[PDB]
């Protein structure tokens, strides 16, 4: 029976395998639910006669 | 409530006291829009003592 937890040594001097990162995930879904989470960006100035 | 969205409007007027519903005419202008997107069956109301 060993150990589960773990941890690692995250020394400066440590290669880039080892060099801790930051990733975040992004996940997208449509249960058919109105909601929307986007917007345009695209407005033209507006001219006359 | 349709189609997903809940909508509400809404008038207010100062009334003469003691009689009910008096006579008149006065439309109801949009208040509030929301796509919540839930049945609705049965409702209830709130008050404050
Ligand atoms: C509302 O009721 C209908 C019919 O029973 C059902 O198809 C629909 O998924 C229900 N929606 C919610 C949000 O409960």
Redesign the interface.
């Given at each position: 029976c060993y150990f589960p937890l773990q941890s690692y040594g995250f020394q400066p001097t440590n290669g880039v395998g080892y060099q801790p990162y930051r990733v975040v995930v992004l996940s997208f879904e449509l249960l058919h639910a109105p909601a929307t989470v986007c917007g345009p960006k695209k407005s033209t100035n507006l001219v006359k006669n | 409530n349709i189609?997903?969205?809940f909508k509400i409007y809404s008038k207010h007027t100062p009334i003469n006291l003691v009689r009910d519903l008096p006579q008149g005419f006065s439309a109801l202008e949009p208040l509030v829009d929301l796509?919540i997107?839930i049945n609705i069956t049965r409702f209830q109301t709130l008050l404050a003592l």
């Open positions: - | 189609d997903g969205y796509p997107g």
